[PDB]
């Protein structure tokens, strides 16, 4: 069990090809029309995990 959870909660610090792993930073540095591209990669990676 522990491993299965640990890996999951670690998978939250991976970029998945984006510029950062923190949503607030992306939302505080990029115009929202240009931010869906970055957010999509994170969403896909986390869904896959």
């Amino acid at each position: 069990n522990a491993q299965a959870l640990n890996t999951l909660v670690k998978q939250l610090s991976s970029k998945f090809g984006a510029i950062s792993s923190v949503l607030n930073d992306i939302l505080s540095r990029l115009d929202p029309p240009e931010a869906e591209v970055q957010i999509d990669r994170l969403i896909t990676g986390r869904l896959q995990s």
């Binding site: 607030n24 930073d25 505080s28 540095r29």
Partner: protein, 50 residues
């Protein structure tokens, strides 16, 4: 041609702050913003021996 080359992150910070500033509160769920590091939580007195 003029090229600006920033680099973000890292522990210290400088070259910013065209905004205002406010007071500080503890033991209260609150939004915060420290040098661009936003978020939300509850702030106490820490014991981390930095």
């Amino acid at each position: 041609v003029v090229v600006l080359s920033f680099e973000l992150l890292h522990a210290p910070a400088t070259v910013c702050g065209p905004k205002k500033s406010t007071n500080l509160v503890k033991n209260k769920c609150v939004n915060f913003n420290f040098n661009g590091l936003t978020g939300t939580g509850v702030l106490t007195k820490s014991n981390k021996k930095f």
